[PDB]
């Protein structure tokens, strides 16, 4: 049983501190802190119905996909504020959606234990359900695409999985979480993916392999969302305690805590700028907040949303951000100058 | 301003018209959240109203009563460790707690579940409809009298049936007393917090009941009536 587990886990805890050194905040304080970053709503896509659960930027940094509880999956043109596609989703509690890197497929998860993948660039011109992935006993909570051949999906049965859409069966099942997994992030090289669960623990797996490679502890509540650093060796987790944190992938411990006395309500989604200097956080304070990377200080607020900002995404161009909230409005924020 | 972009804008406006129709059909519907145990036969009650629009997890029961349409969303396939779908269900018009009355063993678990419902963080405002089903099973099993109601619940002896009750003519008085004791337990765990925020409506039903849709529509109508009284400053 647990005769040796407690002794064999001692080297896990001391390793994160014995080989560590001073935190990155004091070291990076020598760099110039970014000034008050104010960012304006350049466009508002007031098309959706209900609370917008999740959104995903297209690979072109111009196409958006967003999901609502009614079963609406909408692909917007962000540059002109036009909706390219509207898809009526059958599983009408889609927590998350995603855009395939090739841009031909859009996948939506949800509470209904399945992954619905839809064809965009079909020879017919009408978006039809390409496939449905079944085999998860919990609720799908993140649906990030790996590539056109395979898709990673984490659900509410404390497990994530890697599927191949063409055949359908669960190619690989990653288990090891205690509570339901609420969000995963896929690295830019699409070779490792990190998923965080309600057990206040995150875990990195291997898409080709099947067992966990990294575990991460230090949150005091559910890990509400996780987003990879664009570098690929770090990721940010936003939790219910409003104490969003950054974990270095290799270093295998918490680096610093993004905390303040003003913030009370928890996080709902996290995203990163291309350089990562702008970690935005979709707090439940009814307004997303954009803070720095090296100094861990609040830099601005993307206020303008009546309700909680439920999702947050930075383009692959690193040029704009999109915030989706419970007011059914998607706001595209960009720098004023 | 390009011709292709002009046609793209025309397409976006067509989707805008579709989304306005979508606006109307979403605001013309009221979400309802089933919740209960597996012994409760929630899916049995869902079949009882009408043939459900299947699709596990969602069961997606859209129905109209008296020319008023709304969409109840039966659930139960997800994990029951914490019911984390409740956060997704916080705007729902009402939550239907469905429970059975024959099996006294799980009634303590039913009371615990109702206590968890009535004080949830996302349930501080949502009203609750109580559906006590399989009442005929309880009546028959207590007419047999093999299992005393006193051993599981020692407060039956001190309880005498209230006069406000309107039992059916063929109902045995002890059957009525058991029915209203099992009702009073849930009523008493309900009427302890959030009196004005929500109110738990009780009901008795069985496997076959043609008035399930009418009754649930009336209950949601009362919930909306109170919501409008609060919202439109008439309170």
């Amino acid at each position, epitope marked *: 049983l647990r005769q040796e587990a407690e002794q064999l886990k001692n080297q896990i805890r001391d390793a994160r501190k014995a080989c560590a050194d001073a935190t990155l905040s004091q070291i990076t304080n020598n760099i110039d802190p970014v000034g008050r970053i104010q960012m304006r709503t350049r466009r508002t896509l007031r098309g959706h119905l209900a609370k917008i659960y999740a959104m995903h930027w297209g690979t072109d940094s111009r196409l958006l996909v967003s999901a609502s509880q009614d079963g609406k999956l909408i692909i917007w043109d962000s540059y002109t504020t036009n909706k390219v596609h509207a898809i009526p989703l059958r599983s009408s509690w889609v927590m998350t959606c995603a855009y395939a890197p090739s841009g031909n497929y859009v996948a939506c998860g949800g509470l209904d234990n399945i992954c619905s993948i839809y064809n965009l660039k079909t*020879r017919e011109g009408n978006v039809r359900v390409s496939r449905e992935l079944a085999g998860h006993t919990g609720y799908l909570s993140c649906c990030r695409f790996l590539d056109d051949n395979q898709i990673v999906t984490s659900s509410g049965d404390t497990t994530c999985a890697l599927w191949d859409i063409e055949t359908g069966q669960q190619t690989t099942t990653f288990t090891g979480h205690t509570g339901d997994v609420m969000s995963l992030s896929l690295a830019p090289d699409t070779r490792l993916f990190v998923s965080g669960a309600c057990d206040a623990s995150a875990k990195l797996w291997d898409v080709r392999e099947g067992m966990c490679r990294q575990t991460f502890t230090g949150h005091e509540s559910d890990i509400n969302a996780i987003c990879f650093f664009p570098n690929g060796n770090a990721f940010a987790t936003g939790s219910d305690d409003a104490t969003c944190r950054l974990f270095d992938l290799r270093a295998d411990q918490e680096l610093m805590t993004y905390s303040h006395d003003n913030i009370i309500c928890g996080i709902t989604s996290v995203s990163f700028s291309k350089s990562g200097r702008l970690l935005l956080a979709g707090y439940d304070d009814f307004n997303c907040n954009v803070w720095d990377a090296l100094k861990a200080d609040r830099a601005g607020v993307l206020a303008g949303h009546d309700n909680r900002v439920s999702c947050l995404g930075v383009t692959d161009d690193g040029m704009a951000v999109a915030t989706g909230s419970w007011d059914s409005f998607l706001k595209i924020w960009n720098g004023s100058s | 301003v390009s*011709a292709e972009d002009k*046609a793209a804008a025309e397409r976006s406006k067509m989707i805008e018209k579709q989304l306005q129709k979508d606006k109307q059909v979403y605001r013309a519907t009221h979400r309802l959240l089933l919740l209960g145990a597996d012994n409760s036969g929630k899916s049995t009650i869902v079949k009882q109203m009408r043939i459900y629009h299947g699709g596990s997890g969602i069961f997606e029961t859209k129905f109209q009563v008296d020319k008023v349409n709304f969409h109840m969303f039966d659930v139960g396939g997800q994990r029951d460790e914490r019911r984390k779908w409740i956060q997704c269900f916080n705007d729902v018009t009402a939550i239907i707690f469905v429970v059975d009355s024959s099996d006294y063993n799980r009634l303590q678990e039913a009371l615990n579940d109702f206590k968890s419902i009535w004080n949830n963080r996302w349930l501080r405002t949502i009203s609750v409809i109580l559906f006590l089903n399989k009442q005929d099973l309880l009546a028959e099993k207590v007419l047999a009298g093999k299992s005393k109601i006193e051993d599981y619940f020692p407060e039956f002896a001190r309880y005498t049936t209230p006069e406000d009750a309107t039992p059916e003519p063929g109902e045995d008085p002890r059957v009525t007393r058991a029915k209203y004791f099992i009702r009073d337990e849930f009523l008493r765990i309900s009427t302890a917090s959030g009196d004005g925020r929500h109110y738990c409506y009780p009901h008795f039903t069985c496997a076959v009941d043609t008035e399930n849709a009418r009754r649930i529509f009336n209950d949601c109508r009362d919930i909306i009536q109170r919501m409008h009284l609060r919202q439109y400053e008439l309170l």
Partner: single-chain antibody
Amino acid sequence: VQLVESGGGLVQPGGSRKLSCSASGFAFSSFGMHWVRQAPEKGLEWVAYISSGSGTIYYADTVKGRFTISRDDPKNTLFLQMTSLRSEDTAMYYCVRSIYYYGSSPFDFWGQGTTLTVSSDIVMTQATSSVPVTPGESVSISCRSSKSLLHSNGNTYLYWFLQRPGQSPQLLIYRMSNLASGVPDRFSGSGSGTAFTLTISRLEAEDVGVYYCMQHLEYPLTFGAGTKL
């Protein structure tokens, strides 16, 4: 996908009649139906266009007026009513599908055309008209335009098509440097400003026919008689 069109043949000048194009299992209710002509042993030319959910019915100034087009989403049929025909209108006809998103493929499928016999704008030149059918080369077709088609968006609006002897012309290069689906990697397109060049990797027996091109900023949709293979 099928866009097979039907109609009659010979008709008098006072032969006001209807010519239809019927589609197979289709997304017709959300497609911007175009309508193209082709003079005998000559190039193509517009006749009309009706967007999905008709709001922008456009015509060509050559035949604007008497000619009319309409869409029928329920029964999925495109009508063309023609009144007071003249001796010029006798030509091949094609019912073409086209819709526009941020990155859509326009003018993909051309239905089997129908014959008709009867008893400013940007100009497409296509000066070259004869090209050898010799295989194993890298021949290219050059295209002129009245003005640069590179709009401020960042995309050109010129379309390319090949026509083998008997069939409707399948698209090759929508916009520039943007291949379609059925067309293989062999075809390609490039250029800059008013200069356009459709290049071919290898030559085989299926590259024969005439090439055609259309501008799209404004809506004359005129063509230029390309190289006969």
